[PDB]
Structure formats: C-alpha cells, structure tokens
Design a protein around this nucleic acid. Sequence first.
RNA 1: CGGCUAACUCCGUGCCAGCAGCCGCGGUAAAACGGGGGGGGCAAGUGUUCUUCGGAAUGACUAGGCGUAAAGGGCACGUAGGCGGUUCAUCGGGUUGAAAGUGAAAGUCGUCAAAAAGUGGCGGAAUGCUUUCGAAACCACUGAACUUGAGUGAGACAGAG
RNA 2: UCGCCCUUGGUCUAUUCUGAUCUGGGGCUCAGCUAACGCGUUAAACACUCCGCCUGGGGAGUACGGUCGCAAGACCAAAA
Lengths: 128, 377, 28, 127, 223, 204
Amino acid sequence: GRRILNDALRTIVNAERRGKASVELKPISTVMSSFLRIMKEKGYIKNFQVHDPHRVGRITVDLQGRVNDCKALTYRQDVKAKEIEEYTERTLPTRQWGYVVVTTPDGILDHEEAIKRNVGGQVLGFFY
Amino acid sequence: SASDADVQDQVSVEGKAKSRAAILDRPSSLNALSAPMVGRLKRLYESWEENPAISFVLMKGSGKTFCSGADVLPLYHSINEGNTEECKHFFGSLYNFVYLQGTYLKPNIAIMDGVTMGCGGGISIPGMFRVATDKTVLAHPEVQIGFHPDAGASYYLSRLPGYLGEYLALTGQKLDGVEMIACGLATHFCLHSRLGMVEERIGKLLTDDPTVIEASLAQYSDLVYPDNTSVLHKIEMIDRYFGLDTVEEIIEAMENEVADSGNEWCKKTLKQVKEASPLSLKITLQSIREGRFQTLDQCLTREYRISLCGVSKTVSGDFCEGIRARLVDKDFAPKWDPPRLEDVSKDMVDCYFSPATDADDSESELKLPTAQREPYF
Amino acid sequence: MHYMGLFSKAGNIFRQPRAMQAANAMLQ
Amino acid sequence: SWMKGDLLSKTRRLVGGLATREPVWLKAMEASPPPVFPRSNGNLKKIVLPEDPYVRRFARKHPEAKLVEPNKVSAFIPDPARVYGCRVLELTKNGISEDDAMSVANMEYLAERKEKKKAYKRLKELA
Amino acid sequence: DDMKERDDILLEKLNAIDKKLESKLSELDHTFGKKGKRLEEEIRDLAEERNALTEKKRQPLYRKGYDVHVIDVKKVAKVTKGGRVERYTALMVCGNYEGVIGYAKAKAETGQSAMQKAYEKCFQNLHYIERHEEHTIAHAIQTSYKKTKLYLWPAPTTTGMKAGRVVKTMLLLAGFKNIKSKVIGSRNSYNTVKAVLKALNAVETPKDVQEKFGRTVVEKYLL
Amino acid sequence: TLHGAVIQKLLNTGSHLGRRAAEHHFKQYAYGTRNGMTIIDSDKTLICLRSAASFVANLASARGNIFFVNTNPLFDEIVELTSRRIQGDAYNHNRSTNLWKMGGFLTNSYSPKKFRSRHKKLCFGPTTMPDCVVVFDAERKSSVVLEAAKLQIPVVAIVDPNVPLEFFEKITYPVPARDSVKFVYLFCNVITKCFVAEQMKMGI
RNA sequence: CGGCUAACUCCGUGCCAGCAGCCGCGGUAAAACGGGGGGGGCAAGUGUUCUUCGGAAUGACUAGGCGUAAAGGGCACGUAGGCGGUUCAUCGGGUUGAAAGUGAAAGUCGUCAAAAAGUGGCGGAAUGCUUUCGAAACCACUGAACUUGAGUGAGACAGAG
RNA sequence: UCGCCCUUGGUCUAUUCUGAUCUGGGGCUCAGCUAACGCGUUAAACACUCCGCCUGGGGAGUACGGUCGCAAGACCAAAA
Ligand SMILES: [K+]
Ligand SMILES: [K+]
Ligand SMILES: [K+]
Ligand SMILES: [K+]
Ligand SMILES: [Mg+2]
Ligand SMILES: [Mg+2]
Ligand SMILES: [Mg+2]
Ligand SMILES: [Mg+2]
Ligand SMILES: [Mg+2]
Ligand SMILES: [Mg+2]
Ligand SMILES: [Mg+2]
Ligand SMILES: [Mg+2]
Ligand SMILES: [Mg+2]
Ligand SMILES: [Mg+2]
Ligand SMILES: [Mg+2]
Ligand SMILES: [Mg+2]
Ligand SMILES: [Mg+2]
Ligand SMILES: [Mg+2]
Ligand SMILES: [Mg+2]
Ligand SMILES: [Mg+2]
Ligand SMILES: [Mg+2]
Ligand SMILES: [Mg+2]
Ligand SMILES: [Mg+2]
Ligand SMILES: [Mg+2]
Ligand SMILES: [Mg+2]
Ligand SMILES: [Mg+2]
Ligand SMILES: [Mg+2]
C-alpha cells in the first residue's frame, strides 16, 4: 500500500499549497488513517474523518496551512530502535523539525515514541 | 500515567500563535465539572499565566452545552458513604479556580455557546471578556435543588442593576444572550453560525493589549438590542417586589397582587418560587444581599462556609434530597426538611454564615493566595 | 452565511447593474 | 527584500532587530490589524432558490410584464415572476396539486393585471 | 537634533514655495499676453528654487557600527560603432555583527565610483536575521538561487566558520560564529549572495515553530 | 437585529454585485454566483470596512499623512471632498488630480520637474512620504500599489472580484465590493467621520 | 616575489637567450627571461618528478541529468526482472525486543597513567552470523470476502483505421 | 494542482436558448518551474514506478570482430 499512501500524502501537500480547507482521499487503508492520526496529534492537520472503512473507504482531512512536505517511502527500510535517531537525523531535511513514522509490532508510531518504547520496525515515511 | 487519558480528553487544549483555549468535552454529563477536570483546568491556567509566550487564554465548550454546572452525583454518593472530605476538596478546588479567573493577569475570553448553569457562569463571568451567542441560555436553579448559587454567583448577581440578582437567584430564571449583554454579564455577542469567523480572528492575534482584543471582538461581533418582551422591561416590578426585606414579604406581596391584579407574570413567578427549598431561599437572599458590599475573596469565603455547612447535613438534608429527587429517582417531587417557609428560623440560617474557623478547626476555612495574587478586581 | 441567506429570501437583490446589462447588450 | 511575511510581521521583525526605525503607521496597524477570514476551499456555490423553476416557467409565457427592473427605486420589492413562484411554492407546501397551483396562480395574476388595467382606465377617465 | 531642524526648515521652505507656485499657476490661468510670459518666467524661477531645495534634502547616511565589504568588482562592456564602452559594477555587503545584513549593486564609469554608489545604497535594503544563542543557526538549511545550491549546518560553540569567502563574509557580518557551509554548483558571487539571504530567511526558529503549531518548544538540555 | 439593518444598508448600495469569473484569492469574500454575477458577502464587506476605517482613524492620533488616489472620474467630487477634509491645509488640487499619472511619483519623488507650458499642469511630489495611500483605481491606470509596496507603505483599496494576485498581494486593507457611487460615498463618509471624530478628541 | 598566491627595485638582454602548473611573458625603459640589492613562505629541510584520494555534485546511494547544450530506443507487443488497491482471520520466513555464543591480536575512537620523536591497561566499536524465548503493525505465505484500478456484456454512436 | 475561450463525438437536464458531465483536439493564462527562450491539467508543475540513454571537443559513428542482407548496406561499436 505504499503507492496509495504516497498518493494521499501528496494530495494533502498539493491542496495545502493551494490554501484549501479540506481534501478527499481515496483509496484509503488502516495504515493511512494511522499516519493521519499521528499527523493530527502533532498538529499538522486539524482533524480527519473515516467513511465506510470496511466496504469502500474514503477519508476527509481538515487542513490548517501547517505542513510543508509529507512523503511515503516507496521501498523497504528496516530500522532498529537504537538506529532510529541517526536515521531521523539523516532523513529530515532540517534535521530538527518533523517526524518519522514507523510501523512497529506495538503499532504505527512516531520516531520519538518508538525510541521511548524501545521497538523497531519499518519506516513508513515522514512529514515536516 | 495512563489513567489520566480520560481527563485530558475531558479538558482539551487547542493552541494558537500566542493563545491557548481550554475546551470542555464531557458530553455524557453535558460538560459538568468534576474534581479532576477542575484540577486539570487549574494546572493549565496556572502554567499559561506563568508562560510569557502566551498573550491571552480562552475557554470553550464542545456540543450544545457550554457547562451545566458542577457534577453533583459524585458528591452525593460520597456524602452517602459517610465521609465529607471529597465534597470539601471539590469545593475549595472550584472556588480556587473561580478566584484565579477573577484575578487573572492576562486577558481571558469565554465563548458561551449553549446552556450555562451554576458554576458554569462562575468560571467565565469573572473573566475579562465574555462572548454570548444565540444559543446561550443562563439560569441559576440552585434553590430548586436544595443548594445556593455559589462559585462567585453571589458576586456578580449582587452587582446587577436594581434587585434583578435576587429575582434570578430565587426564581432560577433563564437569561438569553441579548439580555445578558443588556445586564452587563456578557461583553460581546455573535451568532452561532458566525463563531468560526471570530474564532479564527481571535486565534491569530499577536497582541497583549486588551483594547486590541476588545476592538477585534466588537468588529467581528453582532449588533443586538433587547426585545420588547425581555425581562429588563419588567425591572420596575423586580425593584418593587424583590426589594422587600424578607422572603415571606416578597411572597405575600406577590400573592396580594395576584389576588388583586391577577398578573400573569406574578403567577409564573409564584410557580417559580414554590418549587424551591424554604431554607435555601432564605440563605440565598441573605448571601445575595451580603455580597453586594464585599470583594470576591470574601464572597467565595462565605460561599465556601455555606457549601461546607450544606454538605455536612448540619441542619437539613435538602441537598441530598434535592439531588436524589431530581437526578436519581427522577420523580421530581422533593420533600424538604422544612416543608414551609415559616419553619425556617434565624438561628438555622445563621449556622451557614458562622465563623467555623472559630471551632478550633482549620480546613473548614477557604484558603486563598491573597498575598501572592494581591487582588485587584 | 446567515445574513446573505436571509436577504436572499426576499425580492430581487440579484439584479444586474445598468453597466453590466449595457455591456451584455454591447456584446450581442 | 528577502524577508517573508506580510507588511506587519516583517516590519515588526525589522523594528525589533533594530534594522529600520519605526514607521508612524506601525502602531495604527497594530491597534487595528487587517482582517482575516477562514480558509474557504474555493468551491463557490450556485445560489439557487426553491421557487426558481416556477420563475423560469413564468419566463415561458408573456414576457412583457413590468418596468420594475429599470425602475431603479429599490432592490427589495419582488417582481411578478418571483411572487408567482413563491405562490406556487407555498401552494405546493400546502399539498395542492402542481398543475392546479400554476393554474390558480396564473388566474390570480391575470385577475390582478385586469384590475390594475381598469384602475388605470379610471385614472385616464379622470385625466 | 541639528538634522531635525535643518530638515524642518527645508520642509517649511518647500511648503511655502508650493503655496506660491499654486497661487501663481492660479493667476497664470486667467492671464494672457506679455503678463502671461512674465508670470511664466516667474514660475520657472520658482520651479528652479524648489528643485534646488529638493536636491539639498538628499543626503545619504551611513550607519555607525556597521562594516561594509566588497564582494565583487567587475568590468563589463557594451559595443558601439565607435568601439567598446566599458563600465564597472560593484557588489557590496554590510552588517553590524548583530543580525542585520544588507547588500547593494551599483554601476558607474570607474571602479571607485561604482563602489561609492554601492556604499551609499547598501543601507537601503537591510534584513534582520535570527540567530540561535548569538552564534549559529537553529537548524540545517538547504536552498538554491538559480543554479547556486547552498548548504548550511549548525555547529557547537568551539567549531568555527567553515565557508568560502562570499559566504564567510556574509555570515561574519550577520554575527554568526559556528556554521559549516557548502556551495554546490555555480559560484556566481551575486547569485551566492542572493542564495545566502534566501537561506537565512527560510530558517524556522523555535519561536516560529511555537507560533506556527500552538505548542511549547523546549531546548532538549533544559528538559 | 440592528446588524441586519446595517447589512441591508450595504446591500442598498449594490456593493455585493461583483463581476463574474472571480479569482482564486477573492473566493474567501464571496457568497455565491447568481445571474452571471459574483455575489459578495456583505458581512465580510462590513468587517473589512470596519478594519480599514479604524486603521485610518488611528492615523489621526499620530498625525499621519494620508494620500488619496482616484483614477475614476465618477468619484472626483467624493474623493476631493474627503481629501479636503482629511488633508487639511496640506491639500493640493493639482497634485491630487495629476501626480498619479506619472510613473515613479512615489519611488522618485525628489526628482526635478520643469515648467513647460499650460500643458497638463505642473505638480510636484509630496514633501513628506505618506503613511497610508487610499486607492480608487479599478482599471489600474496608475502604478500606486506597486510603488507603495516598494516603499513599505500600507494600502487601503477596494478590490473587485477580478483583481490580479500581483496587485492583491500588496493591498494591506482590502475592502471586497463593487465600487458603485453609493458604496464609494458610504466608504468615504465613514472614513471622513472616523478621522474627524478622532481628530476632535485631541482639541484639533 | 605579473595574476591565481604572501612578497619589488636596479642592471643586462631585445620574439633572441630563455621562462611556463594554468592564464600567459620576451619585438629598447621586462615587477614574468638572467644577474645585483631588498623582501615573503616554510625550515634541517625545501623544491622537482611519479603515484593515490580531495577539491570534482567531474559516474551524483548520500547527491546529477536527457525540448533548444552530451543524452528518449522510429513505434509497439511481450520473456525474465522490478514495481503495484481494500477488509477480516491465521501464521511466524523476513522484520522487531531480550538473553547466550562468536566477532584473534595489533591499528582507528574514548580515557587515564607512562614517556618526552618510544608504552600500556580498561572500555567503546567491530554496523554481522548462529541458537533460545517473547511481539504481531508492516513485507512474504495461507483462507474467506470487497469494488474504487484492469477486463467483459447489453444498448447507442463517430471515424481519410 | 486557479480559471477563461473555442472545438470533435456522445449522454443527461432543458425551458426555445442554453446549462451540466464524459471524451479527444486547440488557444490563453493564476501558480509553480526554467541558464534563458519558454512550458503550463495534452507540464518542461507537485510526486512516484519501470525501461532506454549521457559523462569535455576532435579522431569517430571511424577501425576491428560477430550476426544479418542478393547487394546497397544495417546493428552492436573502440583505441592511439
Ligand atoms: K504489457
Ligand atoms: K471525434
Ligand atoms: K504562454
Ligand atoms: K495527469
Ligand atoms: Mg562546474
Ligand atoms: Mg600579492
Ligand atoms: Mg630593460
Ligand atoms: Mg611569477
Ligand atoms: Mg626575474
Ligand atoms: Mg565523488
Ligand atoms: Mg564531496
Ligand atoms: Mg541519484
Ligand atoms: Mg550535469
Ligand atoms: Mg526524464
Ligand atoms: Mg519518440
Ligand atoms: Mg534521437
Ligand atoms: Mg490484519
Ligand atoms: Mg515473522
Ligand atoms: Mg581486536
Ligand atoms: Mg596502544
Ligand atoms: Mg589507548
Ligand atoms: Mg459536446
Ligand atoms: Mg481538454
Ligand atoms: Mg529541463
Ligand atoms: Mg521504453
Ligand atoms: Mg549508419
Ligand atoms: Mg564490419
């Protein structure tokens, strides 16, 4: 589901730079909504709603004008819990702001939370 | 910990460029205040006042209700279990928050977007700015539950023009937002549909100056004038009847006019009065008239004494009986400890106003940081 | 938008001015 | 210059950093900041009224009715077609039939027009 | 306050001349013949006085405590039928070592004259640059202006400045102490100056993040 | 509500009947499209009007210079009376009616000028730079907005639905309306009254 | 010791003799050739040649390109390969957490002591592999389903295919 | 991923003359991009997947070798 995740994150970025209030995402997945929950918690989007997640899912996102770039990795990238911080140093362009989203056995988490819980996994992407 | 994830959901925080908003989100109880909600609110407002990067603060409510008052069911179940400590702690926490709201160093704005009852007005009306909408309904039905209008409600009702504070505190009469502007209890007015406009405007102001915030609120607000059928067009009746010395004098005069003039407003006001406990009507009238000539720390002090006497069941159990009748059993027919007004004595109502600090006890008094806050309101 | 919605339940506030009708007569 | 932001924030940062002396208008802008509105998502809605099909059905008839449009006295009096459409709409909301609603509304309009015709005939007889 | 009163006297003189010119144009509109020509000559004399007085107010000022440095002096040329026409361009930067930086480009007949015109123009476009703890930038920044890619990296407090001369001069004059940098691609000095100013204005400070997201930003060693 | 009566007065001027095919940056001010027109929200018109009028009134207290630029001949008298009232003794009719036609009249205001003939009349630039410019240039016949943005001077202007982004970005106080005679009269009357009410509060 | 590059004058020569890493110097006033005088950088070294990396983002993973500058295959179809929707369930190969084994010494890094052009101890690192036991979100695999991408049908069409 | 004007072939709604939505083909343009010219929903924009190709000029699309072709030649394609 890497392609549709990158499609949705790019749709958000593109309508963000048009100054829009909301976007519609389709197709969606549970990975997409977990990425959006992490983005909403860090304040990059206002709110999001999931419609019909078990038949034909679409997501409405509420925008605020706060995200510069959201990217999904299109390749497999493993990271260990002791490896997360140096990866995030090399992956965020500012090396200060933004978050790397990791799929872990404890769930989909931002990179600081995954360091705190001492759990590694697969990098989904990042936003800043 | 992880057990406080419900309290952080009950009191949300929204952050803007130089401002913070506290949101009440307890939709089961219609945003009724519990002890952890008051503790979280007090912690948040203390931290925001200490922060020099925050210019002003906000208080909003989610849903159709701004705040329905205090959550009295927990206090009722605590009083049923013998110990009175939980009610005590809830009350000095709530009055401490009201005192913080009255003496707050930065501008504070309350958005009143629904029903406001009880201490819901007490956490917002001492503030610097107050925004009322077309869904805002303000009532004080504490006498009809067996309790008194505490949380500083004896401060701002007593300072209304005429004797309207007595009428509101005795009848539990609903006020609308336009009428609340007219009474001076609300500073600004806007429609419900226009609130995103004012909220976006207020959110990205980068000013500390209260004049700039006042000008912005007025510029984005709505212009309203009270209707002909408003309460304030009958203010002379309030000063004629509710200005009498005792409660029974008011009831007798209104009954005499209902016999002579057959005033429909008088009949409706009688049906409002007869549904209250006789004890708390007298305590309410005494505390409303006492609070006219004293400051906020004093008003909260004797309101705490009245509350701590009413929860100990010293002379009556009208608090527990009213709570049980109107919230638990829901038959809505309470039986007070004096059925009649004449049974209530002067010594019984002086037990609520007594200096309980003179009984060799310390936690029966309300603590307030008057030295550190150095009050100015 | 409350006030525009109220005032749209009225007569004709959506009447073109004289210059716009003049230019529309000009173009045809 | 290469600084970002609007005039107010750029000027505040320049004045605070002691780069430019403070202009006279800076306090006036801070006292009354320029207005801000929420994001609108750019989808402008076509303003449609429930009576509009009936008004356009009145356009499928005799076009010469009134000089109300170039009268230029007020923009708050309805013309004949709008009040016809409102009459049909409220009749439909009563529950009467549709074609009967147009028939009775047109007959009432024709009666009113003949009555003002005979009134103007009385004016001309007095003139 | 001497410049204040010497500007006020010229302002009052200019206002008096403008009132006199308005009155004489008013009496010229209804005047025909030789008196019209005499009023025309009187108006021309008044216009000459007003032009001279307006010239006398244009005194360029420099700011004390600022250092001005030459980045680039170039000989450019234009071709005519008589041969090549050669002029000089001067690019200069200025700064007060306290976050204020500016630049100007000027063209004249000689190199000295071009430098002088740029020096007079250099205080007219001043930016304020935010620094972290008066010694470095808040975060790593990468910008490009045309084909000049610029990288800047913050550094701890005993590192030093690692930069080429254009970037080093601009960062020194803005007050930085500990930055590493790299110019990638074209090293056009004027596009390098513009890329440096673009990079320093795209840094998001912790105050900026705190206002943008409505949340508290804390340094990690104070946590 | 009184606010409904205020909105009705704004609708009486016809300032909500904007031109079709609105730009992207104007749609925050629009209510909808009807009858081949862009319908403007008069509530946002009132809010922007209040902001502009309060900014101009606040400049009386600091004795700021306010320069009016009108390029429409329909509004000559209204803007002339407003400038006579606001600028006081420092009003010049020739400069107010001719100086905006010259490219560079603000960015090059110390340049010399020469008397030629009767001509299109001789006018010099302002001796002090203005602290605000109020613009009535619907057809963009002058370079006022570009020079004011170059010089860091605030601009109060009435914006049509078809204003370019390059012009809209440099207008500090936009007022979204159709510039009818009645709306320009109401705008200038409100500006005049606010300025002289603030000016009477100082003894002036 | 012209510029790049810190450091300049006199005499001799006169497109000669010569210099030269690059750009370039020398045809009578050469700071560029050769000598005198002075000066600059390094210093028991200092130049020259060879060789490697850097500067070189000049093979670009980090980190480049292909309209007009080098560079889109004349255009397709398809093999391998690479890449590619949703839900629920199962599983434990990859992934992930801990433990154990191994990762020789020397060298690199940290630190101290020693020593005075010399040594050593303890760590860290050695990004890996094997075994055991947890986790179950993702990838793979298995099962049941979904319809938004692909493909069919029915009914209408247009066309110098 | 803001729009405007045309046009090919359908469909729907029409309210007597037009709107809407697909489908290809053109012109112009807000942004954004571009060394510049310019491109711009049929991108040279914001991103991505897979393939082909480039690595200073000349020597040179030359020499050699293989395969293919009746030939003419073609494809892969150097170095000094
Ligand atoms: K294929
Ligand atoms: K076709
Ligand atoms: K073009
Ligand atoms: K596309
Ligand atoms: Mg190069
Ligand atoms: Mg040198
Ligand atoms: Mg010689
Ligand atoms: Mg040399
Ligand atoms: Mg020599
Ligand atoms: Mg390399
Ligand atoms: Mg490198
Ligand atoms: Mg690459
Ligand atoms: Mg290249
Ligand atoms: Mg390509
Ligand atoms: Mg091709
Ligand atoms: Mg080719
Ligand atoms: Mg699953
Ligand atoms: Mg596994
Ligand atoms: Mg070893
Ligand atoms: Mg060793
Ligand atoms: Mg060692
Ligand atoms: Mg068609
Ligand atoms: Mg098309
Ligand atoms: Mg290109
Ligand atoms: Mg291909
Ligand atoms: Mg060939
Ligand atoms: Mg061959």
